[PDB]
């Protein structure tokens, strides 16, 4: 419900190292192949870090509805980013019931894409005025997550980081690494010295 957004600018990122790790085994990407986005430059990168169940993965999808999709974080159809996740029963799932995480269960309207609602208004859905109390159609709509080590993997915590990409007339602040080759002297070579090339 309070998904953190961080702007990443002016650095170099090795994207395919995360793919060649085999420990974060979700890796859902839209727009471009993981190898091509490694050798691709962008103006800004936005990271969305949050934790869901093992069954709410379908809610993190454009064109798909749901409490996570419509009341917590909405994915636009024109999405060219990446979603990464893994299993975190080691320090997020704890004995006795991990009730630390929250999610918006009710809202008077569906969230727009790239919108966050953190208001603690009592959700009125009936005729009796709430006036801040809990009761009939009068609920604090931030339902709590529940995690246990004996819970199913469909209900086990996955920490999810969502990558975002944007482009404008502003220059590409972030990009990926550029390969280097050992130089050869006294030979006919086909070189590309930085942008400049020649034979």
């Amino acid at each position, epitope marked *: 419900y309070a998904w953190n957004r961080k702007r990443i600018s002016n650095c170099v990122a090795d994207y395919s190292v995360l793919y060649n790790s085999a420990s974060f085994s979700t*890796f*859902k990407c839209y*727009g471009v*192949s993981p190898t091509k986005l490694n050798d691709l430059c962008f103006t800004n990168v936005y990271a969305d870090s949050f934790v869901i169940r*093992g*069954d709410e993965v*379908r809610q993190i999808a454009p064109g798909q509805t749901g409490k996570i999709a419509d009341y917590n974080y909405k994915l636009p159809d024109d999405f060219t980013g990446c979603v990464i996740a893994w299993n975190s029963n080691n320090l997020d799932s704890k004995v006795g019931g991990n009730y630390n995480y929250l999610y918006r269960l009710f809202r008077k309207s569906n969230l727009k894409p790239f919108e966050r609602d953190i208001s603690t208004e009592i959700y009125q859905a009936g005729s009796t005025p709430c006036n801040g109390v809990e009761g009939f159609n009068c609920y604090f709509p931030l339902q709590s997550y529940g995690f246990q080590p004996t819970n199913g*993997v*469909g209900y086990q915590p996955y920490r999810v980081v969502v990558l975002s990409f944007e482009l404008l007339h502003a220059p590409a602040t972030v990009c990926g690494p550029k390969k280097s080759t050992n130089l050869v002297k006294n030979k006919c070579v086909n070189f590309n010295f930085n942008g400049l090339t020649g034979t």
Partner: nanobody
Amino acid sequence: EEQLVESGGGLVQPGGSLRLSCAASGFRFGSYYMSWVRQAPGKAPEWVSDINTRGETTRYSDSVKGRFTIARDNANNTVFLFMNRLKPEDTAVYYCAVAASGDTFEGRSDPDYWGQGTLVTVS
């Protein structure tokens, strides 16, 4: 609507063979992917089996290949899976998944729905 019911696991000695059955409901079965994962102590779920849209093409893990011999039954909406000559480290809860990708771009599109699976113990 959509539901996965599974059976067949148990406690088998090393070197044994066993069956696992998964039946799906709520959606069309014949033209969709079906994957198998296993969860063991130590986390890190390992994706080990997949059947294609065709009823014959099968994708196996590089750790064990051809061990999870597979069938396909579009009329029964039930899949049988045999495994043979068990390692002692193969004790796991086996999950049968649903269709992945589906016109999305490549990069191991993770399946959204998985089953509750069945215990298999080897000792």
